[PDB]
Amino acid sequence: HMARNYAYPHMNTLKNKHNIMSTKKLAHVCEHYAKKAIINLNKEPLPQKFDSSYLKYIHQRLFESTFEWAGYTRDFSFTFDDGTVAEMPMMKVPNLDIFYVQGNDIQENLKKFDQLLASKNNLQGLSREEFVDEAAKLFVFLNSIAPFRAGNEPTQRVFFEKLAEAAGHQLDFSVATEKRIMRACIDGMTLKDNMAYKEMKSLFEDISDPKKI
């Protein structure tokens, strides 16, 4: 019942601070502010701890001009300015018959995500190959959580680009096609144990290659 409260009562478009009713126009305005926020974000030092708090902060910065719930995950019972309360425990993977992590498990998974990074020292002190391997596995995991109502993709990309930088390497998702990145995410959620990570590893190899220039 509460999931419909993220969108307008009379249109499917997501509620937003711009009062924009076209999903197409909203997307554009959204990309605009996200880009502006990245400029200020890039001036800040890299955090000591790479964790869900930092992920939320990125999402907050990317979307605070557009979404009232920016920075809040979809298990958070969010009160809009209009008085309605929104929450989204069930979110399906688009076009496929699988679900992202259920709302009630988001916190435990994000905690596990935080623990892995901390245990592995934010993937520092590794070779580019080792980083690529570990990073790809963590990316697949986080992708399957999809902790936010929307804006998961650009948020997780900024997070991993920052993680790579702090780990002494580089990741530039813009060097690869959207079709390929999606294909890797899908493989990550559909293929058996070993194979799930393969396309993501392959992607990360390419987008971490300085000759990307």
Domains for the chain: give ranges and CATH numbers: 1-213 (1.10.3290.10)
* Resolution reading in Å: 2.3
Q: How far is it, in rounded angstroms, from Cα 159 to Cα 211? A: 22
Distance between CA atoms of residues 128 and 13, nearest Å: 41
Residue with tokens 């220039």: 213
Q: Which residue has the tokens 């986080």?
A: 142
- Per the structure block, which two tokens stand in for 161? 């680009």
Helical axes 23-41 vs 52-63, angle rounded to 10°: 120
Could you tell me if 139 and 183 are in contact, meaning their C-beta atoms sit under 8 angstroms apart?
no
Torsion angle in degrees (nearest 10) through CA of 44, 47, 48, 50: -160
Q: Rounded distance, CA 176 to CA 59, Å?
A: 22
